[PDB]
Amino acid sequence: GSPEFQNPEVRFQQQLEQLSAMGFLNREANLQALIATGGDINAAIERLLGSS
């Protein structure tokens, strides 16, 4: 239906599929990194692995 992406239970659902496919055990932080970028997964992971 129409769930909230902010909810850690969802974790974007689709965006998390790419994050986990690139070898990343983090979940919550990834949801934030995805918001900070706005869909830019590569730019997210780059900074995400460094800090937040």
């Binding site: 070898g23 055990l25 780059e46 692995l49």
Partner: protein, 76 residues
């Protein structure tokens, strides 16, 4: 031993390393193959960041492992 190195872009680089190799040592090999300077190279394993001042024995890296090399671009 053999290993697999997939970049954040999705590139799959095949290289050779020893259980006594260092993170920096691997970076040099990758630099030779590709060309990207080690300073712009980042080694991530299962989300865990492999620090340059570490060994393959620190995070217990085995053979046939899949390492993810993130490329932190300084430009835009």
């Amino acid at each position: 031993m053999q290993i697999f190195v997939k970049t954040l872009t999705g590139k799959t680089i095949t290289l050779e390393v020893e259980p006594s190799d260092t993170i920096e040592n691997v970076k040099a090999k990758i630099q030779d193959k590709e060309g990207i300077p080690p300073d712009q190279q980042r080694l991530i394993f299962a989300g865990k960041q492999l620090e340059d001042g570490r060994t393959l024995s620190d995070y217990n890296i085995q053979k046939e492992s899949t390492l993810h090399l993130v490329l932190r671009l300084r430009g835009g």
